[model samples]
Target: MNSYPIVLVHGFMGWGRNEVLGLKYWGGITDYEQELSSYGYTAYTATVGPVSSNWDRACELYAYIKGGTVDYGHAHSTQKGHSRYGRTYPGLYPEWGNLTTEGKVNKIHLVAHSMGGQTVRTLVQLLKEGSEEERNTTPSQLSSLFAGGKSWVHSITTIASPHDGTTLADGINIFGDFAKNLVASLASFTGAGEKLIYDFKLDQWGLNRKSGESLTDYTNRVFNSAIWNSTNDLANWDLSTDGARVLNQWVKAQSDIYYFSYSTCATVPSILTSNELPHVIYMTPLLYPFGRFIGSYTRNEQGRVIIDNSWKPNDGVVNTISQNGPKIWSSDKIVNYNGVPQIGKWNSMPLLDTIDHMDACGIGTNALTLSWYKGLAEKLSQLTI
Candidate 1:
């Protein structure tokens, strides 16, 4: 039997198909999905809010896959001070939840990188358990996603995702400068500033990019929006160690779905300070400051998650320890991945040593990274019901 279609989900501030000219979020210049499809494995890529909270991203992800107007749920939207609806999609796989010829639910394999791991987990949680809050608030108008008891996913694979959260969020706001610069770079590189090529997807907060508006004006409006001050329903809060701890309190791994995780490490131990330092050769120059900050950062604040030296090793943005899977305030099991894999619990793979955060997605890596993804696809293919 063939494997279920592998849906590639990108991380925070990540883009979708053809969003940034010829570049791809999965493989930069390389077209990973097309290459994988040529090898006979079905694949698709999903686009969600680049900086929205996991809950909002999850809802948008569902809409992208199943084909409908994005619904942020009445209870959630009201609390977060945002619109209850967002952009619609024609559906990447409209039959995602349909019954197959074998009388089983058609399933998909979700592979996410960076913050996407959290978004995928939230989608699975909502699919199986449904949201009691949303159900109670809008009993009649509830979307099928909040109805629960569906197993429309077979497995989840995360690459360098911040499961427990990254300490970088504690020290600085990457959302302000990093994201703005990234958008500007993409616009300038593609020469599509007037075309408005990139979509911040902040429609829920009423920050949609107006047609003919310069990228500079749009980004300035978004970064300085009142939503940042008033709400925790954004990527920064969800990526913080404290915020992730709160998320892990509820978003548990599903029992029927197989979980696989791969962590990336680009730091080395400092001989003098004993603190982890970013590898000059293996890491990108862009991530130097972030890598350095995460490497030596330590904290044990009152009423917050403690971050000792154990959190030093990182892939520039995310802590390697947090990438394996959710551990803080979670009951999920994580085991070292041997030859054979199991369902429900996380089968943590060997760390991608010398790999930085961006490299995990094949940005500045070699041909080996493409083969590595192929190997992962082969592994997923072997996972049959």
Candidate 2:
């Protein structure tokens, strides 16, 4: 039996159960939480700021799991020019870290996909070693999250995450400012956002959609926001290879928790350009452009991490090499899994070839996802506490 509940964290542009009507982020059409629970594995799906920075998302995830209004920390907010607080949530596991009947500490297993993986790692780092700056500044009313003496997580599993960041963040924008403005104007003119339930959850930046506001208006407002031009506090920068390297400097792997990483790839070598091209038959249509872009992208900028041919093969959205673990300017150890799972370091599992970004999360692929998750849960449950 599992010793702790599994919390499913979604990646970029993901939603919770209630956000997108009744669709499930974990299993798409299939409800992964309900399915896992039915199979005797406790599961909870957490919805945080979809496009928020890792720090903000971590704060939101802490509040979502422990039940409280999200406090992005006075230090962080002041520095980033965002509000100190955001929406509240009824905690999924209020008893987390509490003592059990057997005197064991109640903990959770965090399973994340894509950028969710970075969010989880940020949360874990904060839980174990709360920010010194935050502590010194807000000594009196510091949130328990910044107190730093909690070990509420047992293990972390990352799937197709760009731990070293993705070149897509540094790559040229798919659309120019003119194109974006024209599209937003057209959409606004046509009266959009009548039934959209998805929220950007950017209240910290005062960007959350207002009631009776059209989706087009909100979209335009977000794009024109000064936050993007001024701060590196958004997902775009965090997903950038340079930003990820900076994050790796702080979000160290805890010595007591187990770490596992699974990377996927859907691209193959192209004889024409020596680049990896998307396997059209196996990759999803939506990710085709992204995969193709990533497959050929490379950079050697003065201040940024060099993106070479090694970073070309991808699962549509993230570079396959970046998915293994944080290696860019990081000292965290990563070893290939050899039957026994080790603690404190990343156990890199074999690649899930032919799987695209969405397919790894069960959004586009169907047949293997359920069984893959089931097997994963079983594997985690068997680990020693």
Candidate 3:
């Protein structure tokens, strides 16, 4: 059993340490790192751009974990037209300065939620394989992170992640370019600032079109199908059903590492029609409507990917099945959580509790102890893989 530090990677739109005032990501009024620190486990909230692709976010993650300036690979940044350097860590804690527990390697456990799940998945891939372009271009001077084949993380336990990609992203692609432009304009004119949204999604995706482009000018002229096929490809390609399938090809599981994931389901499956319906029961009454929106969402009309009951079960944001872990690399099993864990592929904990995507953070609405995280962290601390 390895007592390595456990890192918490937050989901999309997730922040690190604090938000606005004293608010934090781990707990609302309560605190997770505080609670766990008493349990003899060290934890840190590793943050990345909320809407960036998993690939870029992972690079940022490696830099922060390694306690230095963020280096978004030379070839990657060049081709994508963005800066190679980003935010700096500047030694937030002693751990920030010390990435290696022994020989310049940090052995840590990861607990991520939502899109953060995908971020960590990409991190593992780059850590072991390195980028082909990075190797060819930046040869010999590559970041230690791109060195590959290192046993850095012991296990990754994702909480409500879209490991197989979510069906929601597919629906975004269905919106026409005109609609995209209009939406971008509305958000911009209303003071939401489309540039900010682009920063979250595109800048981190290696996109460099951030100087001065109006929402319409950018979406219609620049951010068209061309860039869609380039830098910020994950803008659509990483979240779609097809995108998840392709991502699985690159983010393969390392045989020596352990994986675990648990998805939140707010819908109940209809026995007769096999359709996943909204849960009327008040696990948290407010989540019912959110669940229904995802549950009833379907492209069943005409020729699109007609989603049936299989795609209906969701945890407010992501579908339960999509959070089960990558299809090619995992097994969807729910062996009881009795402290013992199945090493290797994902051990998807059976849906035994009532939780939503918001609740996964321990405080979308409630500040009480999250239903699963405490036990999951303890079990992960004791796992040796």
Candidate 4:
């Protein structure tokens, strides 16, 4: 069988790098590309903005792989003007789009982390709904080309992707104020940046305003609803209303597109206590009294946070429910070495040793070896075919 080309998309604040050394947000430190190459896979890394909207990120990806300039016309006016800042346009840098365009037997596979999943999904949606005029435009017009049947992508596998929206964002104090002020202040800015912030605010507020909703409840309901409804509208060619909706619709329609999701559960307290304590202690007592209270009040909720705090499910940041996916492939639910119920959802595979989110990504002193990597490689190789 011919090996397929693999594209690895990084998550929010992440870059597709092999090691973390000086890189603060590097998550692809596991050498996934090289490992996959050993199995006859051609790997490509896409570099996109850390905080750009899903649409813009997707366009960046299209330009990087499919070859084109950064087009943000479909984006807000402010973003439209500045989208070309570090990018190479057609005449200026024709070699940037050097990937083969034949759309041959082997299709492209996407493995995205965190926000990159949303970015990948959005690109797919745009390809399904963008018009000819939209397609021809530069920067943002890449989706239109895909929708016009000029591009092809095969499978998507996400790790810790907030495909259902992340509760952590809601916890960000800057987001609320930024949403309110940025649009009005930067209304003059062009491209998708303004619209991205605006839509995010709208969705955030809509979810927040719903009464009696827990983080889990709100996430599952609003995120899924938004994606589903938006995708449906996009499928019917409703791009004018909300571009995010159209992006969501594209993900929904991609039943033929294979998806595999991996979620993390609570790890034992030893890691939390010895490893996380130093970091937690550095915080000002005033900043996170809730975390302190919960830590003291609840006995780590079996490695899960039972009481609501700024951070729950203490993988240090996200909770168990927050990490769960709409469709789960493998769960990591085991009691830590402490002999307590590691709070949160965990995998039921008894034979596998216990692990947490960090461990799932191959971190810690006991890093996963070739056997683990090979096993996963086999699994992914099988899934793609």
Clashing pairs in 1: none
lDDT, ranked from best to worst: 1, 2, 3, 4
- Per-residue CA lDDT of model 4 for 268-353, tens digit only, reads 44332222112223332111332222233322335322334522442322234433332222222322223221223222222223
lDDT value for candidate 4? 0.42
On residues 1-385, what C-alpha lDDT tens digit does candidate 1 reach at each position?
A: 4469999999978998858776677876778888999988888999988889999999999999989989899899888788898888999999998997888778999999999999999999999998989889884767889989989999999999999999887765654666676676455444565564787888777788887788778888998887776789899889989889999999998999999999989853232121222233333344666678889999988988898989999987899899999999999899999978888999999988888777788765422266788888998999978
Is candidate 3 or 4 superior in lDDT? 3
TM-score-sorted candidate list, best first: 1, 2, 3, 4
Deviation (Å) of 363 in candidate 2? 0.9
Per-residue lDDT of 118-216 in model 2, one digit per residue for the tens? 999999999999989999997467788998989999999999999999877776354223224323322222233245456778888878787788766
lDDT of 3 by residue, 1-385 (tens): 6677888898765656643224456765456877776667777778787656677788888877767777788787777677677777753243532455454544788789888888897888887778877877884556766767656778888888887776666666532332243234324333455433433334443444445776546555534545555544453556666666677777877765677877687552232121111222332233444466667776666644456788888876677878877873343333344446666567767762466665677754332264345666777777753
lDDT of 2: 0.80
Which residue pairs clash in candidate 2? none
**Best prediction by lDDT:** 1
List the candidate 3 regions with Cα displacement exceeding 4 Å.
91-106, 173-231, 234-236, 267-290, 300-306, 328-339, 364-372
Single out the weakest 10-residue window by summed lDDT for candidate 1. 269-278
Estimated TM-score for each candidate: 0.92, 0.90, 0.74, 0.55
- What candidate 4 gets wrong by more than 4 Å, as runs, is 16-30, 74-86, 89-103, 131-147, 174-250, 267-314, 317-319, 322-360, 365-373, 383-385
Q: Every model's Cα RMSD, please?
A: 4.5, 5.4, 7.3, 13.5
